[PDB]
Design a protein around this ligand. Structure first.
Ligand SMILES: OC[C@H]1O[C@@H](S[C@@H]2O[C@H](CO)[C@H](O)[C@H](n3cc(-c4cccc(F)c4)nn3)[C@H]2O)[C@H](O)[C@@H](n2cc(-c3cccc(F)c3)nn2)[C@H]1O
Ligand SMILES: [Cl-]
Length: 138
């Protein structure tokens, strides 16, 4: 029963073997979900499921620097469903972020902003109810 948008502190930034876990329910008639791994006002990793982009479901990933978006990465595999519970797991590794949804691998996003110690906040927003958010070293 967390309030969305929710800011999860990542003190000391991210590092290899850090695992972030987000639990919630997609609202009925959802349009999008956003997880923003922020470096101050910049976004090192934007993970953005879209439920109705031109009548299709897609995952868009990108990086924002100085208010401008970089080149998009796109994935047709879409494990979310309107009205249903979900579990997002983000594993940080030396070269990328690895994302799994409902315990199944979804995608990898290579680090563009390499100073991992400065990625100190995760913003969770969009058309969801949020149950829990945590991070641990595994
Ligand atoms: O890159 C990632 C960004 O994407 C843009 S949408 C982007 O806009 C571009 C404008 O030039 C293009 O239109 C681009 N595009 C679409 C197509 C295309 C081509 C063919 C068919 C078809 F279908 C589609 N080609 N190119 C769009 O993806 C979102 O607004 C933005 N964002 C989202 C949020 C945000 C939202 C909610 C909460 C929150 F916290 C943040 N805050 N910023 C972020 O997610
Ligand atoms: Cl969109």
């Amino acid at each position: 029963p967390l309030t969305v948008p929710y800011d999860l502190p990542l003190p000391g930034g991210v590092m290899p073997r850090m695992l972030i876990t987000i639990m919630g329910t997609v609202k009925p008639n959802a349009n999008r979900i956003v997880l923003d791994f922020r470096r101050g006002n910049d976004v090192a990793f934007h993970f953005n499921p879209r439920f109705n982009e031109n009548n299709r479901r897609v995952i868009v990933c990108n990086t924002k620097q100085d208010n401008n978006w970089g080149k998009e990465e796109r994935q047709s595999a879409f494990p979310f469903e309107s009205g249903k519970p979900f579990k997002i797991q983000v594993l940080v590794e030396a070269d990328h972020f690895k994302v799994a949804v409902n315990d199944a691998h979804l995608l990898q996003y290579n680090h563009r902003m390499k100073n991992l110690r400065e990625i100190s906040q995760l913003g969770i927003s969009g058309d969801i109810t949020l149950t829990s958010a945590n991070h641990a070293m595994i």
